[PDB]
């Protein structure tokens, strides 16, 4: 439910609707922090707009997912919208699937209860600490 | 493009028609004495209608890519034919674009090569032989 909730996320980034999305949306932020452009690392680094594109992106996130899902969400979210507005939609439905799917469970429910956090308005951003 | 050939071939298996794809049909055989049921392969190895089912296709057939594109095309366009019919199109988009851009230059002439020979009634069947350059 959570995990179809991220599916969503991830597959429809670009045109989507609703508070939850928008705080996923300030995930970003991370994202810019620990690349920088995104553009350069999209367009330079794994040239998602290459016929190997979505494969080569999965490739970069696929050990960072239990490092922090944060990350991932939102790079899969904006590759995704890139991917969107350069016509490649079925690219957005074949990564939300398997990014939401990939996520273990121990990251999923960390993921849901920062997120959770930020909602109910206990904290100012969507951290990254475990609920022991 | 021979490149966008084998793209169109594993994107729309289901419906595609033509004497170039029909010989690519042909294929099937050497995918099914390598694997046997591929039904077999597809619902209980793979998993091919689960969440991954398109990157656990991949990593399945990635080691082939380089090295025997029959195979690769072949499986490759059986599992978008399932796809098609079980309502996930999208992934045949997804993996025809891959499959076909990431095979190698050299296995790409060479499964012309072959093909060709095919087409022209030279051999029975879609070899795997080089020409005097790559062998
Ligand atoms: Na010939």
Same mark, same amino acid.
């Given at each position: 439910?959570?995990?179809?909730?991220?599916?969503?996320?991830?597959?429809?980034?670009? $045109?989507?609707?609703?508070?939850?999305?928008?705080?996923?949306?300030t995930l970003d932020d991370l994202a810019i922090k620990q690349?920088?452009?995104?553009?350069?690392?999209?367009n330079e680094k794994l040239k998602v707009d290459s016929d =190997?594109?979505?494969?080569?992106?999965?490739?970069?996130?696929?050990?960072?997912?239990?490092?922090?899902?944060?990350?991932?969400?939102?790079?899969?979210?904006?590759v995704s919208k890139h991917w969107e507005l350069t016509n490649?939609?079925?690219?957005?439905?074949?990564?939300?699937?398997?990014?939401?799917?990939?996520?273990?469970? =121990?990251?999923?429910?960390?993921?849901?209860?920062?997120?959770?956090?930020?909602?109910?308005?206990? $904290?100012? =951003?969507?951290?990254?600490?475990?609920?022991?």
């Amino acid at each position: 439910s959570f995990k179809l909730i991220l599916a969503e996320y991830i597959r429809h980034r670009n $045109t989507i609707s609703g508070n939850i999305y928008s705080a996923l949306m300030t995930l970003d932020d991370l994202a810019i922090k620990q690349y920088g452009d995104i553009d350069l690392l999209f367009n330079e680094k794994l040239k998602v707009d290459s016929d =190997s594109g979505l494969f080569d992106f999965v490739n970069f996130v696929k050990d960072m997912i239990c490092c922090d899902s944060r990350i991932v969400v939102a790079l899969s979210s904006l590759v995704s919208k890139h991917w969107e507005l350069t016509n490649k939609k079925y690219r957005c439905m074949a990564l939300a699937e398997h990014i939401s799917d990939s996520i273990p469970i =121990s990251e999923l429910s960390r993921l849901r209860y920062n997120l959770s956090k930020y909602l109910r308005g206990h $904290t100012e =951003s969507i951290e990254d600490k475990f609920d022991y």
